[PDB]
Amino acid sequence: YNFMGVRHDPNMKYELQLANPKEFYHEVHRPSHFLNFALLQEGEVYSADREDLYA
Amino acid sequence: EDLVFTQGSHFMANKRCQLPDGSFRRQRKGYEEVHVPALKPKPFGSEEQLLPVEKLPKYAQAGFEGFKTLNRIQSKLYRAAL
Amino acid sequence: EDVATFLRVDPAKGLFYFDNSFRPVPLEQTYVGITEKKAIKRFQIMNEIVYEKIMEHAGKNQVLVFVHSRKETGKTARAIRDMCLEKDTLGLFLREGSASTEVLRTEAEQCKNLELKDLLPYGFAIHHAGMTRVDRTLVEDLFADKHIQVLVSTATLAWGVNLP
């Protein structure tokens, strides 16, 4: 909860799960680094024309 | 790597390029303009004609929708493709 | 013959070689080879060659300009329109043809593409892969009706659209 520590409360409640913990800098641990991106508005309109021949 | 062609799709194996009869070129100003005149179509053979869709087999007649006859290339290879 | 041998095609029955004279439309091919060693001068000559080539068939027949990039297609179409307006040759493509002119004017107003609407009033047009499908189809539909005098597009149109 180091990045979005504003969501961390001393008196909050949490359940547990028998799983393996993620890394400190995992994708789900820093949502502000992956979710604050502006959406692709009027994008790929002047991109490059390349056909994905294999896909 | 030595035997491969570095140009890829632009590699030219021919050293000389022969153009048509009326294919003169001239450099006007900073660029060379080479004009290739429209080649006249080859005369039709005495026993060659554009066969219509009514001569091909009835099975292939449904695919040729909207075309009364066939092209010159298509008519010359109609028996070799069906 | 090497391709036929690679494909296991008999040279007598399966071999068929038609020369360039067998094309349905005999096309007079013109090659413009820039000889200048300066990149800036070569680019300027290419724009002048395109403008000179467009002016050779301004009101005679439609022109299908082929570009390399989507942004260049718009720049080239506007580059030709700007040169035509500077030289007072903008009216050659769009004569007193209000039937064709009104359709282009009417279609340009309803078009949602800002770049296409700038040339929609004139004979210029753009057809790129980044454009909307409805907008791209109108250019193909407008070009097939002899409405767009000059069509500028990338190599995708030549393969994805059978519009000569």
Strand ordering within the main sheet of chain B:
1-2
Number of helices of chain B: 3
Quaternary structure: part of a larger assembly
Biggest interface, residues from each chain: B-C, 21 and 24 residues
Describe the biggest sheet of chain B? 2 strands, antiparallel
The general outline of chain A is: elongated
Which secondary-structure class do the elements of chain B indicate? alpha+beta
Q: How many strands of chain B?
A: 2
Characterize the biggest β-sheet of chain A: none
Q: What is the distance, rounded to the nearest whole angstrom, between the alpha carbons of the first and last residues of chain B?
A: 44 Å
SSE run of chain B: EEHHH
Terminal CA distance of chain A reads: 39 Å
Describe the structure concisely.
Chain A: Residues 21-55 are annotated as: Required for interaction with EFTUD2 and SNRNP200. The structure is cut from a larger assembly and holds 1 copy of chain A (55 residues) and 2 copies of chain B. Chain A has 55 residues and is low in regular secondary structure.
Description:
Chain A: This is Pre-mRNA-processing-splicing factor 8. Chain A: It is found in: Nucleus; Nucleus speckle. Chain A: Residues 21-55 are annotated as: Required for interaction with EFTUD2 and SNRNP200. Chain B: This is U5 small nuclear ribonucleoprotein 200 kDa helicase. Chain B: Belongs to the helicase family. SKI2 subfamily. This is part of a larger assembly, with one copy of chain A (55 residues) and two copies of chain B. Chain A is low in regular secondary structure. Chain A is 7% helix and 0% strand. The longest helix of chain A has 4 residues, at 32-35. Chain B is of the alpha+beta class. Chain B is built from three helices and two strands, in the order E-E-H-H-H. In chain B, strands 1-2 form a two-stranded antiparallel sheet. In chain B, a hairpin with a 3-residue loop joins strand 1 and strand 2. The longest helix of chain B has 5 residues, at 72-76. The chains are: A little secondary structure (55), B alpha+beta (82). Chains in contact: A-C, B-C. Chains B and C meet through strand 2 and helix 2 of B and strand 1 and helix 2 of C.
